């Protein structure tokens, strides 16, 4: 399915406090008004989605049916894949190149081959309530931002706070989600039949390099943002560095049609040159 | 712990043939060059032969060249010396040695020695 | 032999100093700095006292020192003790072969 | 480690005093880049990466920002922005062997150069000719790795050298690696020289009245002027104001 994503996805990018000031930053953000895929949590277990540059994962659920994720460049043990699983007691993040089954196991708590872990970590758990997450991994670190809010996606603006900064430098290229279920059978391989589970849904969006104008309030919290490259009005606000523009004419930028082709032109004189006959001289 | 043990000495008639062995224990035999050094009664130490850590390189002393053959079994942690055409000047106490604690070209590790008598 | 040329005998009284010389060729002593000195008692394994013209392995006192000039190496033993009496051999690694000196008998009277 | 498959260790959560490597070998080279080494006891770095491998002395020139060659291109590549120091020393006595140490290898063939800090451990045949090598070598098709074969008969240029390249990565958060120093009782309401985890300055320190969120470590007014700081000991927010000055 599809649904446009409103003004969501903004997060504190640099953990430095600023009060009652406007700041423009170029980073990987979620472009405003972009449509996002919508999925339901009944059965098919779940297909893999590429990790282009960063994922904005929102979920409205009330029974902890979704409990983790799995990332890596491949599901086989041929590469140091990653494991991240939340729980009622704590969160468990693991990187052990565990080979996976034909399908991700449906919780019967684990189904994977042997491991050769290089990093392991544990911490407190992540617990009508709209949970939002932003996953980013660019500079050798994998970073998480999050927010839990009471309540479709609301139009209200709210920024995510940096939750965890992990140092793992694995090359992530594909990603999947992890579900759970009560009294469910578990097998290394299964068809699209699945097992019964509660009604639930999760949205997915893809991040892009954009320039954002962020507004900090007197208490250091982000209250509004403008996508500098969305439409001409936003670009004018972003240029004047002011959310309110008065009547007038403004020179915002310049445009230039790009070249559509490249051509090379060389003469026809081939013939090799005598190089290995001067360097290979016997007497200089 | 780390040990070298020579073996295979005995009385043999001149021009005969003998095989010496050196038994390694306590270290990675195949990581180290092995050498045979002997000491003939009344004479000083004499380097006889050196084999590299792999086994693909064998060095011998001229005084025993041709007639002596060095070998090693890195699977069994064993070094060997095949002495053929044994002459009377080959009567000696025979040692195996390596450089486990210093450098490949030194003799810091030694065996106990094997006595070789050529009649 | 082909050994490095050493004095056959040197004698010293306990507490005094003695220097022992080792002359070889341009392919061993005068080629590399891979010169060794050995303390030896017939019937037991030699003990390395000096390897590398002037360097002592672990456990060798600074009373033992080594030197080299040209094709000649030199070992000097200071503070002579009764247990220093032994046979001393220089040694040179030359790449394609190792060569020991002919040995100097040190007697501590 | 071999240079083609070079080892990386992240160092963190500790104090970096370098008086140890000063009681270490006669160094072949200490070429340090973008930082004075004699000041490497007041470091306050966030992350430090320790890449390690062995080469011969003739090849140490390739270990530098913006260098070229078999090592720099197909084995170990450094970025042009390198901020760190390179320490190297002859390890001939331990790593050279009689017939050559053939356990140390390096990549001879690669279709493209590595990106900075990239690692290629592939062992797949190389095509120097125009015949597709189907997992087979021979004429014009080569194995991409080659052993050094360190021998005691080599010159010092061809002798094994152990190399450690320390990359100092900057940041804006807890310098989880800092230098051997000490702390002093905090002073307020006086023009004082302060050193908060590396930030040196002058000014009057005052108790803060602004609500820093638990994940923030610095405070700024307009134009990046450091206005506040959280204590690395009392974890308390402090206001910074430059002490009085003016024209006469
Ligand atoms: C390249 C490499 O190191 N591979 C090893 C593999 O041989 C071993 O079976 C596994 C154990 O978890 O760890 C990894
Ligand atoms: C970061 C990383 O490992 N990227 C590689 C990519 O270059 C390669 O094309 C792909 C399979 O072809 O596997 C992945
Ligand atoms: C964004 C926000 O809610 N800010 C308020 C701030 O205006 C108020 O002065 C303070 C009082 O505790 O509480 C907080
Ligand atoms: C630079 C050059 O040699 N250009 C040649 C041109 O002289 C020739 O007439 C044409 C015919 O194919 O091919 C092309």
Author numbering:
A (entry chain B): 27 to 70, 80 to 142, 157 to 176, 187 to 210, 215 to 347
B (entry chain I): 1 to 119
C (entry chain J): 1 to 109
D (entry chain A): 348 to 595
Question: What sentences appear in the manuscript?
Answer:
Elite nAbs, mainly derived from the IGHV2–5 and IGHV3-66/53 germlines, showed potent neutralizing activity across Wuhan-Hu-1, Delta, Omicron sublineages BA.1 and BA.2 at picomolar NT50 values. In this study, we used single-cell sequencing technology to isolate hundreds of monoclonal antibodies from convalescent patients of BA.1 breakthrough infection and identified dozens of elite antibodies with NT50 values at the picomolar level. To further analyze the molecular basis for these elite nAbs, we determined the structure of Fab in complex with Omicron BA.4/5 S-trimers by cryo-EM combined with X-ray crystallography. Next, we evaluated the epitopes of these elite antibodies and found that these antibodies mainly fall into two distinct groups, which was consistent with the results of the epitope competition assay.
The BA.4/5 S-trimers adopt various conformations when bound with antibodies: TH003- or TH236-Fab-bound S-trimer complexes adopt the “1-up and 2-down RBDs” conformation, while only two TH003 Fabs can be built due to structural hindrance from the neighboring RBD. Group 1 is represented by TH003, TH027, TH236, and TH272. These antibodies, which are similar to the IGHV2–5 germline-derived LY-CoV140415 and XGv26526, target the conserved solvent-exposed outer face of the SARS-CoV-2 RBD without directly blocking the binding of ACE2 and can be categorized into the RBD-5 community. Additionally, TH003 tightly binds to the BA.4/5 S-trimers by extensive hydrophobic interactions and hydrogen bonds, with a BSA of over 650 Å2. S443, V445, P499, and T500 of the RBD form strong hydrophobic interactions with A33, Y59, and W105 of the heavy chain and G95 of the light chain. Hydrogen bonds are formed by Y53, Y59, and D104 of the heavy chain and Y32, Y34, and Y93 of the light chain. D31 of HCDR1 forms salt bridges with R346 and K444 of the RBD. N439, K440, S443, K444, G446, P499, and T500 of the RBD also form van der Waals interactions with Y32, S57, A103, and W105 of the heavy chain and D52 and Y93 of the light chain.
